Amino acid sequence: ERGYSFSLTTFSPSGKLVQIEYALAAVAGGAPSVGIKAANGVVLATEKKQKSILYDERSVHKVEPITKHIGLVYSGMGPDYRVLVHRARKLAQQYYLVYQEPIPTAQLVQRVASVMQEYTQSGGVRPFGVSLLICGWNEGRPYLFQSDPSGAYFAWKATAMGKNYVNGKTFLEKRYNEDLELEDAIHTAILTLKESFEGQMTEDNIEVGICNEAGFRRLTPTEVKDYLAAIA
Amino acid sequence: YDSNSGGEREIQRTMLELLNQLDGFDSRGDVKVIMATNRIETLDPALIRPGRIDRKIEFPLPDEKTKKRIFQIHTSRMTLADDVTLDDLIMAKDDLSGADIKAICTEAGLMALRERRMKVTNEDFKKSKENVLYKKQEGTPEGLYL
Amino acid sequence: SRRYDSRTTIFSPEGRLYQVEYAMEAIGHAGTCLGILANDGVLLAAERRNIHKLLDEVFFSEKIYKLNEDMACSVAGITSDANVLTNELRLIAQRYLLQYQEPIPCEQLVTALCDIKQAYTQFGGKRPFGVSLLYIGWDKHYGFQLYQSDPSGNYGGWKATCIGNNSAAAVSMLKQDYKEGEMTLKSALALAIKVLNKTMDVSKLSAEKVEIATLTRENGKTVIRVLKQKEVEQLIKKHEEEEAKAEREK
Amino acid sequence: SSAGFDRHITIFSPEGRLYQVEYAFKAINQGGLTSVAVRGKDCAVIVTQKKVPDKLLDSSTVTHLFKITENIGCVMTGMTADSRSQVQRARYEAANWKYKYGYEIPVDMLCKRIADISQVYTQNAEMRPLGCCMILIGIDEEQGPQVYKCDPAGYYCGFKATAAGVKQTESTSFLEKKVKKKFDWTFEQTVETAITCLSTVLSIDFKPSEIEVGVVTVENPKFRILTEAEIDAHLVALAE
Amino acid sequence: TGYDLSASTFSPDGRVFQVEYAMKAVENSSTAIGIRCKDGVVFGVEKLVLSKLYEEGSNKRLFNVDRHVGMAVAGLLADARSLADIAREEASNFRSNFGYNIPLKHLADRVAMYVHAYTLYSAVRPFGCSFMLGSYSVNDGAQLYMIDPSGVSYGYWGCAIGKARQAAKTEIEKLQMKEMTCRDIVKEVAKIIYIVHDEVKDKAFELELSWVGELTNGRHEIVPKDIREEAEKYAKESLK
Amino acid sequence: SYDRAITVFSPDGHLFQVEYAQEAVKKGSTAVGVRGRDIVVLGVEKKSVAKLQDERTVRKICALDDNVCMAFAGLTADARIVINRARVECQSHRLTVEDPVTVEYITRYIASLKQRYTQSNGRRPFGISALIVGFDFDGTPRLYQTDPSGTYHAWKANAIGRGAKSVREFLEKNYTDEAIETDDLTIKLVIKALLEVVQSGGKNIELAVMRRDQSLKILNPEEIEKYVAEIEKEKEENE
Amino acid sequence: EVKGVCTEAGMYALRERRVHVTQEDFEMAVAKVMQKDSEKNMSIKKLWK
Amino acid sequence: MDDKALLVEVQLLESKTYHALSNLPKARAALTSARTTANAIYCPPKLQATLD
């Protein structure tokens, strides 16, 4: 490059930022996803489709692990997702080289959102088009956080993103209670993902990852075929 | 502007004959003409150019000096009681005209007649200062320029 | 090449700023902070902007950031922009202690930040910050202090200032009602509960929509107190009782 | 609609889209060429025609079938100048896998390294996003054959049989009708379908001089470009 | 319009007009052909003289990059002398690291990448040049290459650059290529320059011929021009 | 790394940014300053204090060293950079040369700071206008001024801010050496000038003197009322 | 909009042929009328706190 | 409470039992409420022909 470095995101005359609001529009028209925190573990459930019978499902993965106990899904766009995965992978290593201890889940999200915000103020680039759902069972209590293209973190009990997320939002508002078990959380997570799905819900149309206090665990399609018997 | 219709030509000929008889140059006998509008840029240019008018007086802005007279002028013909404090009303509000001051004194007179009194207390002025003057207060860069 | 540059650096042809004016006229929306002192102690009343039934609040300090052992702040603006400054302002106070082995005084912490906020407005064409925040704290020269910060890089010492534009009616209330050396930690707290009752549109002032952080000078410790739940509730019951008692003359 | 400079540089639209990248998807179609990839049970076929407009032009320096490593080949569509720039990147990062790690790079891991680079060109606004496609083949240990496709947006996935170029929506529609009927796939069963799909979509019934076949096999993992004679041998064999 | 200012933006249908504009800049230049016989390559450039306008032998477009490599530039002449410095500098570093002579297949690739690199950014513009690369080697025969301003570079037997592009290669393909000594090809080049470009626009024109092959032992040099002068004597035998 | 020229020329032969910068000086509080032969004086108007707030941080008269005094207009953030730039230079001048800094030396430092700052690329020019007051060695009281373009002069009575030309007119018919004879007469003269611009209700005037021997002293608000009363008393003798 | 909620809660009880109304009937009625372009999302209004 | 799929079942079962007890309008209404609930159903794999 040359030395331009001019930020292409400035304030509106109203006083809002324009490109971040447009980046949120790309997230809302993405694949639906749901995450539920249920007092012994946290369950991530995304919704994976294939436009043909020609694609392969053992290749592209949505639920992606980070350390040994920290999972991560998204709802926005695809190529930008893999960037900040590899960024967060290295970002958890400088914690572990220095402190010799697995990084707490709150400590990642402070660092990932700091990457993402500082990315928007600098010049020549667009913001990301990805929102995240990060979870983990650190120090007894499990956790569930959500980031955004603006770079703001939250702490949900149960949220949803992607298409028709407000419909899934009201559904969890009646479905979720003070506490459940892990298996009940999986049963209501498939229930809310079956809200806006299509007719074929096989072991390949959904893709589910959990966080035990024993650790992160990604579910193979065998159990998801077995657990979808009398689903929702 | 000259159009073909018969709604606009009755203005232009009256305007043109006015500039003709202003500059008739036969016997005017020192007739002094004072012309005034608000804006000036959307006006007739040949009335601006010399030979016609050579005095273009502008009437700029205000200040908190000229106001206090207009407060006293508008609060002169009323039953102004001995319990009213206009100096607090002067210092507080910092952008108003005499037409605002007039609207204060009238609303002060109305509030005194709603509570079935003759004289006006300071409180009727305070509410009138807070009621009427909230119609245009919009736009300021405060604390930026010392 | 050059035709994509937004030119945030140039003055207005009016002869004033143009881009910094947008952030300062933005900043009054969505956020309400205040703080009071007249005696030993200083508080910070906040306002939970959105309280949805599916949140956690595992941190127990949402808007208040304890940036030092003697100081804290209350930010109102872009949330992502807040984490940039508060990580920086926390590190400013710590390199001072490394250099002098002495706690940072409160003015030259504020002037340290405001010079950073200014310099990103002049050169670079960088987006300026959308953050106005407040300051409390205690030092060895003056004591309990309040400060206001602006996105321009302009600051000031105050005693009853605020941030949000809905609090313009509150500053009028504070000019109507303020005392000179009569703060207790009942007088200032009941006054702050009185302010957010009228200025915020929350009916009956739900105790989960507000948040109060105080600071007292205990022995040599300067205890930063963050009160949790029930003391707020009985305060509101105290405030509604003092409203119900005073309206008997009406 | 268009806000700011969303038709020009890679920024967002008010509809939550962008436009430069989806212009680049139909920057392939100015190439005027169609390539088909089919994976069988123990092989992986690449077939691509070539157009020779001039008699004063070689029949050697034309074919898009390139060789990344000794066990990985590819085919390029789109424009040609952007294609060979893409290939030198793939040749370069395959060798760095050897020098850093010691063993041969998988065909899956290479498509990540390519799609990351295409991401960045989308990402920083002051550079062109390189419109050309990418299809790889290769044999993995304990995984069999693979077929992948990098895109100028920056995403990839595995496939079973997937074409690219100009004609996909007729070519992929035929391959779906071929796969879902659950037939056998051995070697020559896989080669014959890779011809007849490209035969029926283009509707040519050609002479064995335009197409090139780049099969890889489990028994012979070397990337191999077929001779014109044995290309003619398969074509008359499927002919009844 | 609106999309045709930078080399970073695409068109709404997916092409780049700045490359399209530079292609027709080369088209408005004089004619230069190149043809290989069975044991060498012959270069031919029609070179215009306006009235006097220089010496006899200024600003020749038959550059000499390596000891066995030639040039036949046409287009904007200032940028052509830049590429001659780049192509010279490239072959030297091949000699330094390695230490056999540069193969012509690499030197086409290494240059055309540098051409392609100027078609991405909004800082620089595309080159307005096009040229021929001719070599000979006893291990590799003769090869003839051809670079456009986009960067698409591959092999030919006979090509032609300039205004007379389609009009000149009409009759190149009428000849033979394998059954020709290059000494026969030398006078065959000179008639085609003499056939095309009637002197209606330009009265005076030169004819510079260069010649690398078996007889010159791989060394590239100009033909003996004033010596033996059999080209133009044979060329003007075509008055009817 | 920012390579973009901001300040360019105009077809008629002027600039743009400097004329836009001097408007910010025109939209600011007024500050005047006169001198004498033994003591100097400078004041500022338009306090506009909220009267319930702190005011030790709102001070707009400062000192670079034990001789040099400041008074600016314009915006406030850009003034703070210039002041902390100038405190370093007058301290580093004392490091090499063992003198106190002359008041002429530091004004060349500020003006050369501001000129190269409009010259370079990517840089918004400053928006202040300072009044630099200090009495050098051999007892030479003088005052200079600055400009956002970077020029500087030596005046006997300056005025800047919102409405200086009225003040410059009021000082124009005030060309008396007798007013620069008595010290308290000079101070009430500044109060006479500042009340001619601002409404000046005894709480909006901040004056400060320097007797060329001691650091500056803000006068007491009783003395502001004491000087305004004798100004009212001397003006009431118009009959 | 108070009228619209009263009509929608009435219309929901109509199709059930029922002269009674629940609290939930109004909850789905307000959610029908509260259909705006400034969508909720929790991220439009929390990034600006 | 929560449910959507089993609601489709009990509406059909009532619209039978009003038609069993000879009710034209109410069974028509209970069928119509059964349809508009079934419209948002992602899967009527078998219940569709039951509903039809």
Side-chain angles (χ1 to χ4, degrees), chain E residues 178-197:
Chain E
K178 293 173 69 175
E179 291 83 3
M180 294 293 173
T181 64
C182 279
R183 191 183 67 249
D184 295 327
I185 290 298
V186 168
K187 69 181 182 67
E188 285 293 326
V189 170
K191 69 172 74 173
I192 309 302
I193 308 298
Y194 183 77
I195 283 170
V196 84
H197 182 269

PDB file of all heavy atoms in Angstrom, chain E residues 178-197:
ATOM      1  N   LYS E 178       7.756 -25.947 -40.837  1.00  0.00           N
ATOM      2  CA  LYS E 178       8.733 -26.987 -40.563  1.00  0.00           C
ATOM      3  C   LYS E 178       9.669 -27.219 -41.730  1.00  0.00           C
ATOM      4  O   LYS E 178      10.813 -27.634 -41.529  1.00  0.00           O
ATOM      5  CB  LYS E 178       8.020 -28.293 -40.234  1.00  0.00           C
ATOM      6  CG  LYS E 178       7.252 -28.247 -38.949  1.00  0.00           C
ATOM      7  CD  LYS E 178       6.454 -29.514 -38.782  1.00  0.00           C
ATOM      8  CE  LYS E 178       7.382 -30.693 -38.538  1.00  0.00           C
ATOM      9  NZ  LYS E 178       6.642 -31.949 -38.241  1.00  0.00           N
ATOM     10  N   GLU E 179       9.203 -26.961 -42.942  1.00  0.00           N
ATOM     11  CA  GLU E 179       9.950 -27.241 -44.157  1.00  0.00           C
ATOM     12  C   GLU E 179      10.701 -26.010 -44.640  1.00  0.00           C
ATOM     13  O   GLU E 179      10.905 -25.825 -45.841  1.00  0.00           O
ATOM     14  CB  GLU E 179       9.012 -27.760 -45.244  1.00  0.00           C
ATOM     15  CG  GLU E 179       8.434 -29.149 -44.975  1.00  0.00           C
ATOM     16  CD  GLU E 179       7.216 -29.134 -44.070  1.00  0.00           C
ATOM     17  OE1 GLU E 179       6.772 -28.033 -43.680  1.00  0.00           O
ATOM     18  OE2 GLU E 179       6.704 -30.223 -43.742  1.00  0.00           O
ATOM     19  N   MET E 180      11.107 -25.157 -43.715  1.00  0.00           N
ATOM     20  CA  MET E 180      11.701 -23.880 -44.054  1.00  0.00           C
ATOM     21  C   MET E 180      13.028 -23.726 -43.339  1.00  0.00           C
ATOM     22  O   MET E 180      13.110 -23.928 -42.128  1.00  0.00           O
ATOM     23  CB  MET E 180      10.775 -22.734 -43.659  1.00  0.00           C
ATOM     24  CG  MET E 180       9.474 -22.671 -44.427  1.00  0.00           C
ATOM     25  SD  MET E 180       9.711 -22.277 -46.166  1.00  0.00           S
ATOM     26  CE  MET E 180       8.042 -22.489 -46.780  1.00  0.00           C
ATOM     27  N   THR E 181      14.065 -23.387 -44.088  1.00  0.00           N
ATOM     28  CA  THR E 181      15.237 -22.792 -43.473  1.00  0.00           C
ATOM     29  C   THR E 181      14.918 -21.347 -43.147  1.00  0.00           C
ATOM     30  O   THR E 181      14.130 -20.692 -43.836  1.00  0.00           O
ATOM     31  CB  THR E 181      16.452 -22.850 -44.394  1.00  0.00           C
ATOM     32  OG1 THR E 181      16.201 -22.051 -45.553  1.00  0.00           O
ATOM     33  CG2 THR E 181      16.724 -24.267 -44.831  1.00  0.00           C
ATOM     34  N   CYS E 182      15.536 -20.847 -42.078  1.00  0.00           N
ATOM     35  CA  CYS E 182      15.265 -19.473 -41.680  1.00  0.00           C
ATOM     36  C   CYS E 182      15.834 -18.455 -42.654  1.00  0.00           C
ATOM     37  O   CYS E 182      15.316 -17.338 -42.728  1.00  0.00           O
ATOM     38  CB  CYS E 182      15.795 -19.199 -40.281  1.00  0.00           C
ATOM     39  SG  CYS E 182      14.697 -19.791 -38.994  1.00  0.00           S
ATOM     40  N   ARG E 183      16.862 -18.825 -43.417  1.00  0.00           N
ATOM     41  CA  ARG E 183      17.380 -17.931 -44.445  1.00  0.00           C
ATOM     42  C   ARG E 183      16.356 -17.718 -45.554  1.00  0.00           C
ATOM     43  O   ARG E 183      16.278 -16.633 -46.141  1.00  0.00           O
ATOM     44  CB  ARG E 183      18.668 -18.506 -45.007  1.00  0.00           C
ATOM     45  CG  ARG E 183      19.451 -17.578 -45.891  1.00  0.00           C
ATOM     46  CD  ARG E 183      20.651 -18.310 -46.433  1.00  0.00           C
ATOM     47  NE  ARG E 183      20.236 -19.373 -47.344  1.00  0.00           N
ATOM     48  CZ  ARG E 183      20.355 -20.672 -47.089  1.00  0.00           C
ATOM     49  NH1 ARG E 183      20.864 -21.072 -45.932  1.00  0.00           N
ATOM     50  NH2 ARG E 183      19.947 -21.564 -47.979  1.00  0.00           N
ATOM     51  N   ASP E 184      15.561 -18.747 -45.852  1.00  0.00           N
ATOM     52  CA  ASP E 184      14.409 -18.578 -46.729  1.00  0.00           C
ATOM     53  C   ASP E 184      13.324 -17.743 -46.070  1.00  0.00           C
ATOM     54  O   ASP E 184      12.628 -16.981 -46.749  1.00  0.00           O
ATOM     55  CB  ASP E 184      13.835 -19.943 -47.108  1.00  0.00           C
ATOM     56  CG  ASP E 184      14.797 -20.768 -47.929  1.00  0.00           C
ATOM     57  OD1 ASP E 184      15.571 -20.181 -48.708  1.00  0.00           O
ATOM     58  OD2 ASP E 184      14.811 -22.006 -47.766  1.00  0.00           O
ATOM     59  N   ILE E 185      13.176 -17.880 -44.751  1.00  0.00           N
ATOM     60  CA  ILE E 185      12.145 -17.166 -44.007  1.00  0.00           C
ATOM     61  C   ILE E 185      12.432 -15.675 -43.961  1.00  0.00           C
ATOM     62  O   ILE E 185      11.497 -14.863 -43.948  1.00  0.00           O
ATOM     63  CB  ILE E 185      12.016 -17.810 -42.609  1.00  0.00           C
ATOM     64  CG1 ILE E 185      11.390 -19.185 -42.761  1.00  0.00           C
ATOM     65  CG2 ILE E 185      11.181 -17.002 -41.635  1.00  0.00           C
ATOM     66  CD1 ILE E 185       9.999 -19.123 -43.340  1.00  0.00           C
ATOM     67  N   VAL E 186      13.717 -15.294 -44.014  1.00  0.00           N
ATOM     68  CA  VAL E 186      14.123 -13.889 -43.933  1.00  0.00           C
ATOM     69  C   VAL E 186      13.521 -13.079 -45.073  1.00  0.00           C
ATOM     70  O   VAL E 186      12.919 -12.021 -44.856  1.00  0.00           O
ATOM     71  CB  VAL E 186      15.657 -13.777 -43.916  1.00  0.00           C
ATOM     72  CG1 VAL E 186      16.084 -12.349 -44.122  1.00  0.00           C
ATOM     73  CG2 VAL E 186      16.202 -14.248 -42.596  1.00  0.00           C
ATOM     74  N   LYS E 187      13.610 -13.594 -46.295  1.00  0.00           N
ATOM     75  CA  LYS E 187      12.985 -12.881 -47.398  1.00  0.00           C
ATOM     76  C   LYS E 187      11.477 -13.091 -47.413  1.00  0.00           C
ATOM     77  O   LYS E 187      10.752 -12.318 -48.046  1.00  0.00           O
ATOM     78  CB  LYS E 187      13.613 -13.306 -48.719  1.00  0.00           C
ATOM     79  CG  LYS E 187      13.304 -14.711 -49.141  1.00  0.00           C
ATOM     80  CD  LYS E 187      14.004 -15.022 -50.443  1.00  0.00           C
ATOM     81  CE  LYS E 187      13.667 -16.412 -50.920  1.00  0.00           C
ATOM     82  NZ  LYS E 187      12.232 -16.490 -51.298  1.00  0.00           N
ATOM     83  N   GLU E 188      10.985 -14.113 -46.716  1.00  0.00           N
ATOM     84  CA  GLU E 188       9.543 -14.294 -46.613  1.00  0.00           C
ATOM     85  C   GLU E 188       8.935 -13.310 -45.631  1.00  0.00           C
ATOM     86  O   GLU E 188       7.770 -12.927 -45.766  1.00  0.00           O
ATOM     87  CB  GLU E 188       9.216 -15.726 -46.208  1.00  0.00           C
ATOM     88  CG  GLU E 188       9.404 -16.706 -47.333  1.00  0.00           C
ATOM     89  CD  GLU E 188       8.397 -16.487 -48.438  1.00  0.00           C
ATOM     90  OE1 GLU E 188       7.254 -16.092 -48.132  1.00  0.00           O
ATOM     91  OE2 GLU E 188       8.752 -16.704 -49.614  1.00  0.00           O
ATOM     92  N   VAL E 189       9.702 -12.913 -44.614  1.00  0.00           N
ATOM     93  CA  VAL E 189       9.259 -11.866 -43.700  1.00  0.00           C
ATOM     94  C   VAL E 189       9.125 -10.546 -44.438  1.00  0.00           C
ATOM     95  O   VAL E 189       8.135  -9.821 -44.279  1.00  0.00           O
ATOM     96  CB  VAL E 189      10.243 -11.749 -42.522  1.00  0.00           C
ATOM     97  CG1 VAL E 189       9.955 -10.519 -41.684  1.00  0.00           C
ATOM     98  CG2 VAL E 189      10.155 -12.963 -41.658  1.00  0.00           C
ATOM     99  N   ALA E 190      10.098 -10.241 -45.295  1.00  0.00           N
ATOM    100  CA  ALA E 190      10.226  -8.898 -45.842  1.00  0.00           C
ATOM    101  C   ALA E 190       9.122  -8.586 -46.833  1.00  0.00           C
ATOM    102  O   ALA E 190       8.779  -7.418 -47.037  1.00  0.00           O
ATOM    103  CB  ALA E 190      11.584  -8.737 -46.500  1.00  0.00           C
ATOM    104  N   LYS E 191       8.557  -9.611 -47.468  1.00  0.00           N
ATOM    105  CA  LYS E 191       7.450  -9.325 -48.363  1.00  0.00           C
ATOM    106  C   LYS E 191       6.198  -8.959 -47.581  1.00  0.00           C
ATOM    107  O   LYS E 191       5.443  -8.091 -48.020  1.00  0.00           O
ATOM    108  CB  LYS E 191       7.182 -10.492 -49.314  1.00  0.00           C
ATOM    109  CG  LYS E 191       6.626 -11.741 -48.693  1.00  0.00           C
ATOM    110  CD  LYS E 191       6.223 -12.740 -49.743  1.00  0.00           C
ATOM    111  CE  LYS E 191       7.434 -13.385 -50.351  1.00  0.00           C
ATOM    112  NZ  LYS E 191       7.060 -14.480 -51.275  1.00  0.00           N
ATOM    113  N   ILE E 192       6.017  -9.522 -46.385  1.00  0.00           N
ATOM    114  CA  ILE E 192       4.783  -9.310 -45.634  1.00  0.00           C
ATOM    115  C   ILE E 192       4.749  -7.899 -45.072  1.00  0.00           C
ATOM    116  O   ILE E 192       3.695  -7.248 -45.037  1.00  0.00           O
ATOM    117  CB  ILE E 192       4.650 -10.362 -44.519  1.00  0.00           C
ATOM    118  CG1 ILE E 192       4.851 -11.763 -45.079  1.00  0.00           C
ATOM    119  CG2 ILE E 192       3.293 -10.282 -43.863  1.00  0.00           C
ATOM    120  CD1 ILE E 192       3.905 -12.140 -46.187  1.00  0.00           C
ATOM    121  N   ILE E 193       5.905  -7.409 -44.621  1.00  0.00           N
ATOM    122  CA  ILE E 193       6.038  -6.004 -44.270  1.00  0.00           C
ATOM    123  C   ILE E 193       5.832  -5.138 -45.503  1.00  0.00           C
ATOM    124  O   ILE E 193       5.224  -4.065 -45.435  1.00  0.00           O
ATOM    125  CB  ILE E 193       7.413  -5.752 -43.633  1.00  0.00           C
ATOM    126  CG1 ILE E 193       7.673  -6.727 -42.488  1.00  0.00           C
ATOM    127  CG2 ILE E 193       7.512  -4.329 -43.141  1.00  0.00           C
ATOM    128  CD1 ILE E 193       6.705  -6.622 -41.348  1.00  0.00           C
ATOM    129  N   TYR E 194       6.322  -5.597 -46.651  1.00  0.00           N
ATOM    130  CA  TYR E 194       6.143  -4.829 -47.871  1.00  0.00           C
ATOM    131  C   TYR E 194       4.720  -4.948 -48.398  1.00  0.00           C
ATOM    132  O   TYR E 194       4.210  -4.010 -49.021  1.00  0.00           O
ATOM    133  CB  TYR E 194       7.148  -5.278 -48.925  1.00  0.00           C
ATOM    134  CG  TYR E 194       7.074  -4.487 -50.204  1.00  0.00           C
ATOM    135  CD1 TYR E 194       7.610  -3.211 -50.280  1.00  0.00           C
ATOM    136  CD2 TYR E 194       6.455  -5.013 -51.334  1.00  0.00           C
ATOM    137  CE1 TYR E 194       7.536  -2.478 -51.452  1.00  0.00           C
ATOM    138  CE2 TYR E 194       6.380  -4.293 -52.513  1.00  0.00           C
ATOM    139  CZ  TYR E 194       6.922  -3.026 -52.567  1.00  0.00           C
ATOM    140  OH  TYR E 194       6.847  -2.306 -53.738  1.00  0.00           O
ATOM    141  N   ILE E 195       4.067  -6.094 -48.180  1.00  0.00           N
ATOM    142  CA  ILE E 195       2.676  -6.248 -48.599  1.00  0.00           C
ATOM    143  C   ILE E 195       1.770  -5.339 -47.790  1.00  0.00           C
ATOM    144  O   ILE E 195       0.980  -4.570 -48.345  1.00  0.00           O
ATOM    145  CB  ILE E 195       2.219  -7.718 -48.505  1.00  0.00           C
ATOM    146  CG1 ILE E 195       2.766  -8.542 -49.664  1.00  0.00           C
ATOM    147  CG2 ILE E 195       0.700  -7.839 -48.468  1.00  0.00           C
ATOM    148  CD1 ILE E 195       2.553 -10.014 -49.481  1.00  0.00           C
ATOM    149  N   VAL E 196       1.880  -5.396 -46.469  1.00  0.00           N
ATOM    150  CA  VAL E 196       0.949  -4.639 -45.664  1.00  0.00           C
ATOM    151  C   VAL E 196       1.482  -3.218 -45.479  1.00  0.00           C
ATOM    152  O   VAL E 196       2.642  -2.922 -45.784  1.00  0.00           O
ATOM    153  CB  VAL E 196       0.718  -5.354 -44.324  1.00  0.00           C
ATOM    154  CG1 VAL E 196       1.803  -5.013 -43.312  1.00  0.00           C
ATOM    155  CG2 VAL E 196      -0.699  -5.145 -43.825  1.00  0.00           C
ATOM    156  N   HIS E 197       0.602  -2.322 -45.009  1.00  0.00           N
ATOM    157  CA  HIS E 197       0.856  -0.885 -44.883  1.00  0.00           C
ATOM    158  C   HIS E 197       1.248  -0.250 -46.210  1.00  0.00           C
ATOM    159  O   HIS E 197       2.437  -0.040 -46.476  1.00  0.00           O
ATOM    160  CB  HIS E 197       1.901  -0.544 -43.818  1.00  0.00           C
ATOM    161  CG  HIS E 197       2.118   0.932 -43.656  1.00  0.00           C
ATOM    162  ND1 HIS E 197       3.078   1.621 -44.370  1.00  0.00           N
ATOM    163  CD2 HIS E 197       1.465   1.857 -42.913  1.00  0.00           C
ATOM    164  CE1 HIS E 197       3.027   2.901 -44.047  1.00  0.00           C
ATOM    165  NE2 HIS E 197       2.057   3.072 -43.166  1.00  0.00           N
TER     166      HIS E 197
END
